Design a binder for these strands. Structure first.
Lengths: 64, 68
DNA sequence: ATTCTTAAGAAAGACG
DNA sequence: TCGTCTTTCTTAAGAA
């Protein structure tokens, strides 16, 4: 309506909708962050597995 | 003018496009959430493999360095 | 020209 | 009752 309680309610709702959308937008980028971070660590751990396996076979050929 | 029939068709075409694009995003978000779980499981499998090999390599060293 | 993507506003419940 | 938060529908502007 042409009220004034309506105008303040619309303004407060617009504030609330913007806040709720920016919050939900970061939670989706936060999940996208974890994908790039877990892919970083899983590739570091995979290099560590190869490193340890290499040194185990180097150490085991001392038996020859 | 600005409420022609070109306006109605364009706005009805855009409504269909917004629903299609919004459905793709929610799906793309849901696939990312599932990627996190399988990467977490793989991260746990790799951490346990590292510790297993770390203990195996440690014990094998202690044997060589304890040579009389 | 089009479709696709993004941000915004409005209204209705959900919630405390 | 009041409030804020969350969700659906739609529009408008701009990117592709």
């Amino acid at each position: 309506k042409h009220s004034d309680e309506y105008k303040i309610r619309r303004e407060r709702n617009n504030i609330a909708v913007r806040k709720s959308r920016d919050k939900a937008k970061m939670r989706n980028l936060e999940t996208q962050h974890k994908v790039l971070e877990l892919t970083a660590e899983n590739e570091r751990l995979q290099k560590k597995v190869e490193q340890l396996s290499r040194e185990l076979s180097t150490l085991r050929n001392l038996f020859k």
